[PDB]
Ligand binder design. Structure first.
Ligand SMILES: [Mg+2]
Ligand SMILES: [Mg+2]
Ligand SMILES: [Mg+2]
Ligand SMILES: [Mg+2]
Ligand SMILES: [Mg+2]
Ligand SMILES: [Mg+2]
Ligand SMILES: [Mg+2]
Ligand SMILES: [Mg+2]
Ligand SMILES: [Mg+2]
Ligand SMILES: [Mg+2]
Ligand SMILES: [Mg+2]
Ligand SMILES: [Mg+2]
Ligand SMILES: [Mg+2]
Ligand SMILES: [Mg+2]
Ligand SMILES: [Mg+2]
Ligand SMILES: [Mg+2]
Ligand SMILES: [Mg+2]
Ligand SMILES: [Mg+2]
Lengths: 104, 149, 271, 77
RNA sequence: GUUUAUUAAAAACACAGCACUGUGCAAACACGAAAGUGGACGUAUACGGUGUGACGCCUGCCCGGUGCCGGAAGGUUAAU
């Protein structure tokens, strides 16, 4: 459908709940008949600059071929969740599958 | 307000002490809590000859029945399956009456003025620690796991 | 929708109606009505306490849920109705168990939407949930001051309150007046602005339209005699005195708040 | 009524005298307060609209003596 | 439209509108020694007071005086 690239930045104290978030988001997509191409936890990572008075964050990359309705629901989930700090969804021309240059 | 004590109070005297206090402190807290009698010389001859050891015996057998209860408050775990949201954020809290409800349903039938909480609601599913004040001295702890329903 | 009237007569020259075609063109829900007898601004002594009140059209009272206690149970919106008792429109909602109630109508609410109170309620315009569950920065109305007392803030046609902060037991609010007030974080609040935002865009056009609303005419104080008002008197138009009440209290600028009980709840005054 | 239940104090009337000795009638109200007194014998609290002089009286005589006097007076509490 | 019942119906009052200002709710205010009541079963798009008086173009300068608002370093200053 519409290939999206989703990266979100989690509060590092909520690092244990990350696979629970990933499994809910994946069940949202596949429940909406969407594909998941790559799914790359980047772990805790030192920020370039302190957002929200803190210096590290837990990063998650996810490439998705879903309809836009569940993506707007996912954006609202990121909006109202206080565990997630930043969320970025970027529309992509195609489905990407190769690992990230920082997953290496 | 000269007043004789029936129990030791942490800053003025022990049992059997005739200490001047303020009137609102005797009239509102000590006397209505049975902790002090205003120092009438009739009360003094009433107390010091007989009750100088009668109140020391019932206060010691009270501290021994409590310090027995605090010792037996080694039951140590209470799992309360309250309602919760996702990623923490418990829907419905566990209060003082609900903690006393759960140690009654597992252990001692305990009351709410013994429970010590820094926050008190803990509307958060997971582990926490809760201290007790079943005596003026002897405190107990039970790990309570509030679990999402 | 505001509708400027054509000037077929003076008194229609300057009238702007506020026409909402979604309002129910029928009788209100009868069980939720009660009698509202007029007062004339007169207390149990019969004296006029507040002046300029009197007359007007007969009004039945609509029982409105401000406490909003039906938690967990969803409710669909049956129809929108007119309330003469207040500036905002009301919504007749039907719970699943068969109970019907009146709520204040929010801005974007229409017939057929689903609402739900309670802690597990969603965050859409219409839901009512405690402000420790409501995100900081949202616009709410029908706000309680005390838990379970009922909503008292932001009930007028277009109002809303932003939630600017939260420090434990309290949240800090930005009232519509500009005042910053602390409220306990367990008080219920209802999402979204209140509906009829263009209510203030009406123009009554004539004096009778205020007499319909029970507003008797206001005689200004300098048109009186000195026995009646401090402003009264003069052998022409004379006002050589400072503006006061009929009881000799300065009006242009003088503050009148004398509540030392609630000063701890006021962060900043309006301005 | 501004009447101490214990002492029977009552608003008396007097004068405001100015510097020019202008006399206006005033009242002298007693310092009445409603207070819950713990009665240990009946093991309950009893509310009394009592002045602070009466609170000094209760602190000296004891509340059981005073409620005996109020019953001998024929006053409810 | 209202008004001096019984020498004045008017350019007087009111008016829709405008502005200033107060008021966060147990609201301000008012009647009440008080309890209470109105405001209002309303909640700042609300209520009260004040001035002006549809609409159109507009509303300029002065805060020294008198008021009001804000300030709290210093001086003075009550009972105690
Ligand atoms: Mg008026
Ligand atoms: Mg007017
Ligand atoms: Mg007028
Ligand atoms: Mg005149
Ligand atoms: Mg005068
Ligand atoms: Mg002249
Ligand atoms: Mg002049
Ligand atoms: Mg005389
Ligand atoms: Mg005419
Ligand atoms: Mg006439
Ligand atoms: Mg005449
Ligand atoms: Mg004539
Ligand atoms: Mg009232
Ligand atoms: Mg004029
Ligand atoms: Mg000018
Ligand atoms: Mg000046
Ligand atoms: Mg000043
Ligand atoms: Mg001074």
């Amino acid at each position: 459908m519409r290939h999206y690239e989703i990266v979100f930045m989690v509060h590092p104290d909520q690092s244990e709940q990350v696979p629970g978030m990933i499994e809910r988001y994946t069940a949202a997509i596949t429940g909406a008949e969407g594909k998941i191409h790559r799914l790359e936890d980047w772990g805790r990572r030192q920020l370039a600059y302190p957002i929200n008075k803190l210096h590290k964050a837990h990063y998650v990359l996810m490439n998705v071929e879903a309809p836009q309705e569940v993506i707007d629901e996912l954006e609202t989930t990121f909006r109202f969740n206080d565990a997630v700090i930043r969320s970025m969804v970027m529309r992509t021309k195609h489905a990407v599958t190769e690992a990230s240059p920082m997953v290496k | 307000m000269q007043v004789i004590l029936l129990d030791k109070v942490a800053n003025l005297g022990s049992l059997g002490d005739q200490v001047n206090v303020k009137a609102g402190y005797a009239r509102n807290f000590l006397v209505p809590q049975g902790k002090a009698v205003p120092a009438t010389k009739k009360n003094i001859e009433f107390f010091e000859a007989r009750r100088a050891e009668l109140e020391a015996k019932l206060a010691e057998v009270l501290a021994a029945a409590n310090a027995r209860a605090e010792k037996i408050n080694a039951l140590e775990t209470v799992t309360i399956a309250s309602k919760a949201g996702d990623e923490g954020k418990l829907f419905g809290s566990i209060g003082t009456r609900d903690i006393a409800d759960a140690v009654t349903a597992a252990g001692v039938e305990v009351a709410k003025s013994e429970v010590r909480l820094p926050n008190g609601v803990l509307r958060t599913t997971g582990e926490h620690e809760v201290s007790f004040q079943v005596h003026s001295e002897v405190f107990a702890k039970v790990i309570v796991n509030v679990v999402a329903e | 929708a505001v509708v400027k009237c054509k000037p077929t007569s003076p008194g229609r020259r300057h009238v702007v109606k506020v026409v909402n075609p979604e309002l129910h063109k029928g009788k209100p829900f009868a069980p939720l009505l009660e009698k509202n007898s007029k007062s004339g601004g007169r207390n149990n002594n019969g004296r006029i306490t507040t002046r300029h009140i009197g007359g007007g059209h007969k009004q039945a009272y609509r029982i409105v849920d401000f406490k909003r206690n039906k938690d967990g149970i969803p409710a669909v919106v049956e129809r929108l109705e007119y309330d003469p008792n207040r500036s905002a429109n009301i919504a007749l909602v039907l719970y699943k168990d068969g109970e019907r109630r009146y709520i204040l109508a929010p801005k974007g609410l229409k017939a057929g939407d689903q609402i739900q109170s309670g802690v597990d309620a969603a965050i859409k315009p219409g839901n009512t949930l405690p402000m420790r569950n409501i995100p900081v920065g949202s616009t709410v109305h029908n706000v309680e001051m005390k838990p379970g007392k009922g909503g008292q803030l932001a009930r007028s046609a277009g109002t809303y309150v932003q939630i600017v902060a939260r420090d434990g037991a309290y949240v800090t609010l930005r009232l519509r007046s500009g005042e910053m007030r602390k409220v306990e974080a367990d008080c219920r609040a209802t999402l979204g602005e209140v509906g009829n935002a263009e209510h203030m865009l009406r123009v009554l056009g004539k004096a009778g339209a205020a007499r319909w609303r029970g507003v008797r005419p206001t005689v200004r104080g300098t048109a009186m005699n000195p026995v009646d008002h401090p402003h009264g008197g003069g052998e022409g138009r004379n006002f050589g005195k400072h503006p006061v009440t009929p009881w000799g209290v300065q009006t242009k600028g003088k503050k009148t708040r004398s509540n030392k009980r609630t000063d701890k709840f006021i962060v900043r005054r309006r301005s | 009524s501004r009447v101490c239940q214990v002492t029977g104090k009552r608003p008396v009337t007097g004068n405001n005298r100015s510097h020019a000795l202008n006399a206006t009638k005033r009242r002298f109200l007693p310092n009445l307060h409603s207070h819950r007194f713990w009665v240990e014998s009946e093991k309950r609290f009893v509310t009394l609209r009592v002045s602070a002089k009466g609170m000094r009286v209760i602190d000296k005589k004891g509340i059981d003596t005073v409620l005996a006097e109020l019953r001998a007076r024929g006053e409810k509490y």
